[PDB]
Amino acid sequence: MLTDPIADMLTRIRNATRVYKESTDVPASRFKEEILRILAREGFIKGYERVDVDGKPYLRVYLKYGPRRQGPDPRPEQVIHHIRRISKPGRRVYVGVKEIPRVRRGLGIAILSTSKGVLTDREARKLGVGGELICEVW
Amino acid sequence: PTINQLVRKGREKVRKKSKVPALKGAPFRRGVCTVVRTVTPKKPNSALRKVAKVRLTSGYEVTAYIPGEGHNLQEHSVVLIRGGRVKDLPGVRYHIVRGVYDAAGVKDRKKSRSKYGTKKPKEA
């Protein structure tokens, strides 16, 4: 019945990106969208749109890749090189503002749920708030 | 393990084994030679190796290597035991400290003199 729908969403992204899919579908939640809002805003995904497979709400996510490459193996570089759930139903992870992580030394982003919404590490730090470490991306 | 398993049973902290009941965890131990005798090493090596069975203050009788070319240990010689085994004599977990109690130094020794309990020779 899906233990962790967020994890499942991140995993749908990683699985799709590793086979260079144009887009992928994920059963919809408001929370899922708010995560995607950010992925988009930070440029890991082209963006998303609500849709309706067989009478039911999904979020179709539009994946983004690098240029095709030279040499044996011309597969594009990933924009999303790495996307990893931190907090999870079996071990929830919470961090206040002063111990938010710096992910891949600035070139990455962490994402968290806060009392002011879903923010990145930079948003949160500048807002002065902590929250649940949903996941990290780079 | 899942984190819940780790909560429930946790991880077993290592725990580890003395090579050396010089009881107490003393660094040394007084004993008396019970028997002084020679023994033969384990397969690869061949020698007439010098060991003393030693009855200890620590309550334990154990064997102990007598390092150095030549020695002066006999049946009631008092001895300082040291710890350190010998990859070659099975069940010899200890050395005798030359230069102490009844263990003489090693005569003519000139190089590694402070092991082997040998006084700095006179350069007359």
Add this chain to the structure above:
RNA sequence: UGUGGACCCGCCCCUUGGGGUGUGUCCAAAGGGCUUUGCCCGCUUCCGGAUGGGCCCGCGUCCCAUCAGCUAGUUGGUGGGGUAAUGGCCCACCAAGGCGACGACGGGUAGCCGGUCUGAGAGGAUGGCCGGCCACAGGGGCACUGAGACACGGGCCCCACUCCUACGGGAGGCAGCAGUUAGGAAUCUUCCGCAAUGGGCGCAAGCCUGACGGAGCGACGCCGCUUGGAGGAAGAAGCCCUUCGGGGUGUAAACUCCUGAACCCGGGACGAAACCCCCGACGAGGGGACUGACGGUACCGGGGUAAUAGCGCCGGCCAACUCCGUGCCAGCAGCCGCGGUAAUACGGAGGGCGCGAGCGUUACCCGGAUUCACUGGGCGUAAAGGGCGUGUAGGCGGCCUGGGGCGUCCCAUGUGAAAGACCACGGCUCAACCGUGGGGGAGCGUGGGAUACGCUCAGGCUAGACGGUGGGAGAGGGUGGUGGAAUUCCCGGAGUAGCGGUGAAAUGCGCAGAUACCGGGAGGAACGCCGAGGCGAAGGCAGCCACCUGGUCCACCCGUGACGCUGAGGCGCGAAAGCGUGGGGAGCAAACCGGAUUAGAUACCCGGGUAGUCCACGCCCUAAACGAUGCGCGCUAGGUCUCUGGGUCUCCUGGGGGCCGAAGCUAACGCGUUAAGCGCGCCGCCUGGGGAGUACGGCCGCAAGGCUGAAACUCAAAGGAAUUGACGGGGGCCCGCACAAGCGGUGGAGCAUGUGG
């Protein structure tokens, strides 16, 4: 006397026994000194302060579950007792509770913390010194006195031990400072002084203070300093190597200058200004006097001598190599391993490297060890998936809206003592050490705030899950029956000389007529073809028929509305063998008897043969119980064969079973929409090999045995996968006088000759 206070009761307020108030009762006291109608010290009661405490509560606080049940003042109540005070603290009475897998109880270990050591951190280890808390004072109980003690140098008793004794009795408690003795690898002066700071008593003078301040001893530790500095040869001697020219020690020395640790001379501290005395008032404020253990020390000035250096290592890790001696000896050794006559690994020399008043060793802790893995590991074959279901606790929980604000985050604030750590500036000539100031710091309390996520309550949805209707395939299970083939045996017939059996034989069966053939019958076991796939959670399930019965798939999209996943324990199922009571017994067949084979043959081959194999009931509970792969869910190319549903059916769509493969994973082999990929949940399990699935204990079992499951000791590996070989009483293909086909010899005889002896 009663300012006041205590107590019962009533009243008001307050809200656990807090504050007030009324009447009743009940409760105080101590004097001493002076320069004396005034001062100083004391005495009594009450109120408030400050300081120090007691008791209580939340949370945190090691190892064993081979410790799983614990508990009688035990849990609670009522009324007492007790105390400063709550309280089963203690006691009567009543009730029957209380605690425990969120680990009670028990056993083992341990004082706890600030800190400390290690570590990148998270962690790990530790808790000596200094600070804080606790406990103890020869062992055990006990109270007294008191503001306080159940009292370290107070008391009682018991016990242990010692001492004096005139034998009547007495005395004692260093875990205070020193010291002795014993134990030990090992740890100091029976030091100086109260000058300082602090403490007790006193109006004060002052007394006391092994607290303390100092000195001493110990390289035990850290910091600092010295053993010279500058010059000085293409380079003495000695000693080592040598290719007999040299090369090395080495600018090292000798030698010239220079400086001047120690020494000796002179001077000489800070730390000490108070208390006290006088003016003032015995206040503030001003003035005076005493006082130094350390110490004739630190330090300053003046003279002034070239003045201790050692320890470890030089095979690799690891920085640093030659000669001799030695010859698996002597010896080295942390691991790999060195040593067998040219050893950079033994011992010595020279030479070198590394540290240096030290250098090594042993012990122990952290590191390295992502080798208990939170950070940060794993289980197909390396150690590791539980034999499989069912399911309890527990863990985890789809989509939407609202309320709450416990988690969570934010802000403020309190707390987080000092010392230590960290930053800055300062004091000792530096540093160590020390001062002063500064920033931190999780935790936790309080107030305020946020609501994304987690939780919770409320409502909602239908994608998960269950259900209805309709269809289906199936060795899924159970009970009853009954069908043919075959084997055996019995009764017959017919027929006659062997059958059987092996590599070959024999045992055995057979003239009391076997074998082969036919008829009659019995009885047991298993179901040929179909037949490869199918069913089941696993084990496992195969003739046909009937009854009973479980799982499962599909379709309609009809009902419920998250009802879900997993699952420590528990319950049930669990091949074969095996066990118990019965039955049954054809074939087979452990053991066993015979025959062979063999060096032996307690085996393999042959002839027999008992349990057993079969059935009922009851046990046992294991396994290569295997896919050596836990369950559930989602996600990530396809191709092809196949089982079984559905389909405006040349293909689509679901559920299973196979093979090949995308991406990806994997040590590799391999796996790959039936994952070993990508992820979330939950369970189980691993932590080198042997010892050992052993011992001990405990549980289960009628027994066999099962489950749970160590350590000593031992080894430096055990091991997975793949690679190159080599090998095979493995395969294919192929060769040579290899065999085979031939012809002639050797082995016998004499002798020649080489050899063993």
Add this chain to the structure above:
RNA sequence: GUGAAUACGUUCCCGGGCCUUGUACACACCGCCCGUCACGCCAUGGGAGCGGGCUCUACCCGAAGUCGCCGGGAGCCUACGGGCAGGCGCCGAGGGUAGGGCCCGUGACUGGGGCGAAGUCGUAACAAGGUAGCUGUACCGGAAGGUGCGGCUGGAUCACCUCCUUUC
């Protein structure tokens, strides 16, 4: 000089080549290796028992001390309602006796275990290891082991099957 025989064939013997296969060999099958038995050393389990430590249960005796009742036909004080002595009792350190639990030590002897350069017997395993192996179980045998039943492939040379796959 004189001067033959014979070769079907490659199954077998000795040696060898190429591919393949299994391997626990690699000093490479003149390899490895298993168990009894024999010897030595080490550490252990069991063992008639013996000896401690701790602990629990019941019963008996019970010091000090607080506390409670009495203090009378009873002494001493008095501040005579009282106090003190004195007496009884509870609890009680400990001690005694009996039986359990746990832990330690030790024990004639004894089971197996590990280690011991070249012990005896056979040859179980590794190559179809010469009877594929392994496995739970059961019986038997100096010893490995054998044999029964069932399982596993971590075996099978074949074969022919079906699948995959590559045809061209």
Add this chain to the structure above:
RNA sequence: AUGUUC
């Protein structure tokens, strides 16, 4: 058919 060892 069997057929050990170094």
